[PDB]
Design a protein around this nucleic acid. Structure first.
Length: 131
DNA sequence: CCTGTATTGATGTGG
DNA sequence: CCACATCAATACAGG
């Protein structure tokens, strides 16, 4: 179920997306950095039957100054559309928020420290239905 | 032919 | 009305 080759085709799909050297350092560093976090990506989140650009998602997330700002202000529409995702996924923002929390929360919080888990968790409760 | 894991999409709530 | 959240079906691989 977890084979390095299976992941190779998955990340290879991430580098083929385009010839952006800066993007390579991200994917390369992210898989490396995640090793330190202890949360390695055995499967990249997929969107529209395609791998999610962990790099473009990041730049948009940092562009708002912290994942929490996006939740409280809901700037996911800009992220969701910024990536040109198909309206076929109604849980796009949630897919982006849920997954960003697990995989990119360290790179965004550890390298930039834009916010804290309580702010993010509190923002999550603020958007999650009370019941 | 079956079973397990990961990912995508429908409908409803609140201002 | 839209964006978001919860729950369920499908595709691929081993035998």
């Amino acid at each position: 179920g977890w084979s390095f080759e299976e992941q190779f085709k998955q990340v290879r799909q991430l580098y083929e997306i385009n010839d952006d050297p800066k993007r390579k350092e991200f994917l390369d560093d992210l898989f490396s950095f995640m090793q330190k976090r202890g949360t390695p990506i055995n499967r990249l989140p997929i969107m529209a039957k395609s791998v999610l650009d962990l790099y473009e998602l990041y730049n948009l997330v940092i562009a708002r100054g912290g994942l929490v700002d996006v939740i409280n202000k809901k700037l996911w529409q800009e992220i969701i559309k910024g990536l040109h995702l198909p309206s076929s996924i109604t849980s796009a923002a949630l897919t982006l928020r849920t997954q960003y929390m697990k995989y990119l929360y360290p790179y965004e919080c550890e390298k930039k420290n834009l916010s804290t888990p309580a702010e993010l968790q509190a923002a999550i409760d603020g958007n999650r239905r009370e019941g």
